[PDB]
Structure formats: C-alpha cells, structure tokens
C-alpha cells in the first residue's frame, strides 16, 4: 500500500471590500431601451450576493451555461457585464449561442463559448396600452450578418429596388426599421418580455 | 502530457470540481481519464521493448 | 517624418512607435467614416490626464497653448461612452503602442525604456506590456495620428516629429 499525511485545518483569504453594488438598479429599473440599442452596464468593486435573487422567484427562465447557479457564492470574477432590453414573447428561444433567426443575425447573438446566465420574466401590464404600444423599435432588413456583441446604429435607406435607392426613397426601397405592437387585447407570445444577460 | 485538454473544458480537476455539479463533471473526468490511460500504456510498452 | 497627416489603412493591428524626443504628437482618432455622421473614437493625452470619448465630434488641427483642446472637437451629441483617468506618458525615450480589437474589446500595449538617441531606429530588444483595455464595441477600418503644433514662443513650432 501507500501512505500519505492528512491535512489538519483549512484557511480562507479574500479581499476586504464591502459595498452592496447596484444589482437593484439593473433589475429594479424604470424603463429599458430597445432591442437594437441594448444598453451595456459595468458592475465592479462589489460584494455581490447571488442567491438573494432566488428568494424572489418571479422569473420564468433562469439558465446558466458554464457554471452551476449554486456555486456562485464562493467564486471571484472580473469584468461582470450586464445587458438589458425588451423583446417579443416568442424570440426568447432565439437568445442562445448558435441559433438561426431574424434577430439572431440582425440584432443580437452570443458567441459559441458563452459563460454566464440569462434571465427572462413577463411584463404585460406595465408595458402594454389598450391603444397599442408602438414605441419599441427593431430592424428587419439588412444584407449582412453582424458579429457577436456588435451594435448597429443606422437610419439609412436600404438599397432594395433594382434601381439606386437614392432618389427612390419611398416604395420599392423599404426603410429597414420597424416597430412592434403590444396590446392587452392579444394572447400569449405577443407580449413584451424583460431580458438580462450576465457575462463573466 | 498533464497539460492537455483531450476535449474537456480545462486541464485542472479542481476547477471543474469548483465550477460544476457532478452530472456535468462526469464527462470531462472520463475524457481526461482515457487520455492519461493511453499515455501510460504507451510508455510501459516502450520500456519493455528497450 | 512630417515637416511643418492623412488616413492609414487599419484591419490588421497597427504598431505605432516613436523613440526620439517627443512632446508634439499627442492623440489618435479612428472610425469607419471619419466624420460626425457615424460612430468615432477620440483619445487625447497631452500633459495632465487621458480623455476618451466615443461620439460624433466635429473634426474642425494645430494645438497651441490641460490646454487648448477644442480644435479637434466642437460638441459631442448623442453618444454613450466617456472616460477619464491618469495620464501614461512623460515629459532617447522609446514609446511603443499596439492597437488591437477582438470581439469589440480594444487592447493597448505600452512599453517605455530610456535610451541614448543615435539612430532613427535602434536594434534593441523589447517586450511590450498591457496597460489599458476598454470596451469600445464599434467597427473601425481606418485611423489617423494627430500632431499637436505647439507654440514655443518663437507663427508656430517647427514640427519635425517622426513616426
Ligand atoms: C425590485 O423591486 C421590488 C419591488 O417591491 C423590490 O421588492 C425588490 O427588492 C427589488 N430588487 C430585486 C428584486 O432585486
Ligand atoms: C466596418 O466599416 C467598413 C467601412 O467601409 C465596412 O466596409 C465594414 O464592412 C464594416 N464592418 C462591420 C463589421 O461593420
């Protein structure tokens, strides 16, 4: 057989900063931007509690890719990234690494080696008007696929017709920016949903 | 040879053990085990031939 | 070597390095189309700090006698990112910068070593160090280097900076 010497005790050494940094502001928030103008926020110099979120189970979706949602309480990260926006009720599946869809190659796409979590919950009361919500904007026409974590801002006219779409600024040359419609008059799947993505 | 992934997500056991629950760590552990077994067998055969 | 500076093609990383006496060359500008119509990046490092903004600035040149800086920009309208921090330069002396952009992340390596100036470019051995790393997140395809035309009370300084 073989012989070893067993340990006697255990020690732990961690930094010495105590600030409840704004996880509330990202989640408790008044109004999020559109899908194609997703806002990026920095979280740093924190002592962040993660299981405190699990005491309020109102999020339909809580999935994590490269780490279990219970070991977050004894790990130290750097470059914590937060993205927040609101999309339709059936594009939630499209928010995943390596998917095929409109916003998959037009508005947002994660890399193939993601490390983080995605959270989605419903909001059909604070974000709906009986007259229809038309203040949420997204892109439908573009000839190229964007790379992950790339933002596009362009109000230019798509060259769509067979003729140069410079003097043809009306029909036959479509504007690439469309707006959604959100009402309390329709059923599931056609309602706004709030999405937060965390990158480590 | 102890610094090769062999297809797993890392090369250190303790990182996997501190990042994941067992149902996901089993596959990475298996891949590492297979690689190290192959290397050991090759070394032993060469030594006998010498 | 400029004697008293147009665009230079990007897309493979740029090694910029001046080694001679340097108090003239100050900043750098980038972008897809260098104007106030599409997203542009501006970095100014003169004598007191570093000012980094990502907006659509009006590209109005010479920088006379923190100093007179409105020459490059007039107003920053409808933009997201701002940044200020400690300056890195100092006021023979080799300075080396490497511009990189992967996944939208902007890398800047730096390395400084005092030497004796006899050659326009010596045969020394160097190893650059990473200093600043920022989330720019824009698309860059050209770049341009400023040459701050100071006023040494001489109608401007005899610019002879080389890069
Ligand atoms: C978000 O707002 C609710 C409103 O009552 C509050 O109770 C909660 O503490 C806030 N923060 C969360 C859920 O992280
Ligand atoms: C960046 O801008 C240049 C400008 O000509 C363009 O050719 C290129 O396709 C753009 N790249 C991306 C990823 O937007």
From Swiss-Prot, chain A:
Subunit field text: Binds to host ACE2. RBD also interacts with the N-linked glycan on 'Asn-90' of ACE2. Cleavage of S generates a polybasic C-terminal sequence on S1 that binds to host Neuropilin-1 (NRP1) and Neuropilin-2 (NRP2) receptors. Interacts with host integrin alpha-5/beta-1 (ITGA5:ITGB1) and with ACE2 in complex with integrin alpha-5/beta-1 (ITGA5:ITGB1). May interact via cytoplasmic c-terminus with M protein. May interact (via N-terminus) with host bilirubin and biliverdin, thereby preventing antibody binding to the SARS-CoV-2 spike NTD via an allosteric mechanism.
Organism lineage string: Viruses, Riboviria, Orthornavirae, Pisuviricota, Pisoniviricetes
Glycan-linked positions: 8, 10, 16, 28
Domain of life: Viruses
Name by which UniProt lists this protein: Spike protein S1
Region Integrin-binding motif: start-end pairs: 88-90
Result for mutant: residue 178 to N: Reduced host ACE2-binding affinity in vitro
Effect of residue 169 to A: In strain: Omicron/BA.1, Omicron/BA.2, Omicron/BA.2.12.1, Omicron/BA.2.75, Omicron/BA.4, Omicron/BA.5, Omicron/BQ.1.1, Omicron/XBB.1.5, Omicron/EG.5.1
Effect caused by changing residue 53 to I: In strain: Omicron/XBB.1.5, Omicron/EG.5.1
Source organism of the structure: Severe acute respiratory syndrome coronavirus 2 (2019-nCoV)
Consequence when changing residue 190 to H: In strain: Omicron/BA.1, Omicron/BA.2, Omicron/BA.2.12.1, Omicron/BA.2.75, Omicron/BA.4, Omicron/BA.5, Omicron/BQ.1.1, Omicron/XBB.1.5, Omicron/EG.5.1
Outcome following mutation: residue 181 to S: In strain: Omicron/BA.1
Impact after mutating residue 145 to K: In strain: Omicron/BA.2.75, Omicron/BQ.1.1, Omicron/XBB.1.5, Omicron/EG.5.1
Cysteine disulfide links: 21-46, 64-117, 165-173
Effect annotated for changing residue 162 to N: In strain: 20A.EU2, Iota/B.1.526, Omicron/BA.1, Omicron/BA.2, Omicron/BA.2.12.1, Omicron/BA.2.75, Omicron/BA.4, Omicron/BA.5, Omicron/BQ.1.1, Omicron/XBB.1.5, Omicron/EG.5.1
Effect of residue 31 to T: In strain: Omicron/BQ.1.1, Omicron/XBB.1.5, Omicron/EG.5.1
Effect of residue 137 to R: Increased resistance to neutralizing antibodies. Decreases HLA binding to NF9 epitope. Increased binding affinity to human ACE2
Entry function: Attaches the virion to the cell membrane by interacting with host receptor, initiating the infection. The major receptor is host ACE2. When S2/S2' has been cleaved, binding to the receptor triggers direct fusion at the cell membrane. When S2/S2' has not been cleaved, binding to the receptor results in internalization of the virus by endocytosis using host TFRC and GRM2 and leading to fusion of the virion membrane with the host endosomal membrane. Alternatively, may use NRP1/NRP2 and integrin as entry receptors.
Region (Disordered): 4-20, 140-175
Annotated region (Receptor-binding domain (RBD)), positions in chain: 4-200
């Amino acid at each position: 057989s073989n012989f070893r010497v067993q340990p006697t005790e255990s020690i732990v050494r961690f930094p010495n900063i105590t600030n409840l940094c704004p996880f509330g502001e990202v989640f408790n928030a008044t109004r999020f931007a559109s899908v194609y103008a997703w806002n990026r926020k920095r979280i740093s110099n924190c002592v962040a509690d993660y299981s405190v979120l699990y005491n309020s189970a109102s999020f339909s979706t809580f999935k994590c890719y490269g780490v279990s949602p219970t070991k977050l309480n004894d790990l130290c990260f750097t470059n914590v990234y937060a993205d927040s926006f609101v999309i339709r009720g059936d594009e939630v599946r499209q928010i995943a690494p390596g998917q095929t869809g409109k916003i998959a190659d037009y508005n947002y796409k994660l890399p193939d080696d993601f490390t983080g979590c995605v959270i989605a919950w419903n909001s059909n009361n604070l974000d709906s008007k009986v007259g229809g919500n038309y203040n949420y904007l997204y892109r439908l026409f573009r000839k190229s696929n964007l790379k992950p974590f790339e933002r596009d801002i362009s109000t230019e006219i798509y060259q769509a017709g067979s003729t140069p779409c410079n003097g043809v600024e009306g029909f036959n040359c479509y504007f690439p920016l469309q707006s959604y419609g959100f009402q309390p008059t329709n059923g599931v799947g056609y309602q706004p949903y709030r999405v937060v993505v965390l990158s480590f | 040879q102890l610094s090769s992934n062999f297809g797993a997500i890392s090369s250190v056991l303790n990182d996997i053990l501190s990042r994941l629950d067992p149902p996901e760590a089993e596959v990475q552990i298996d891949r590492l085990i297979t690689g190290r077994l192959q290397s050991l067998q090759t070394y032993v055969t060469q030594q006998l031939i010498r | 070597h400029a004697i008293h500076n147009p665009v230079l093609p990007f897309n493979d990383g740029v090694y910029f390095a001046s080694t001679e006496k340097s108090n003239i060359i100050r900043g750098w500008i980038f972008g897809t189309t260098l104007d106030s119509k599409t997203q542009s990046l501006l970095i100014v490092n003169n004598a007191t700090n570093v000012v980094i903004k990502v907006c659509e600035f009006q590209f109005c040149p010479f920088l006379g006698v923190m100093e007179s800086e409105f020459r490059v920009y007039s107003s920053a309208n409808n933009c997201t990112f701002e940044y200020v921090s400690q300056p890195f330069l100092m006021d023979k002396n080799l300075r080396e910068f490497v511009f990189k952009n992967i996944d939208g992340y902007f890398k800047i390596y730096s390395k400084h070593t005092p030497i004796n100036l006899v050659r326009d470019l010596p045969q020394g051995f160097s190893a650059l160090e990473p200093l600043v790393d920022l989330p720019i997140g824009i698309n860059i395809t050209r770049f341009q280097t400023l040459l701050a035309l100071h006023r040494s009370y001489l109608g401007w300084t005899a610019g002879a900076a080389a890069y």
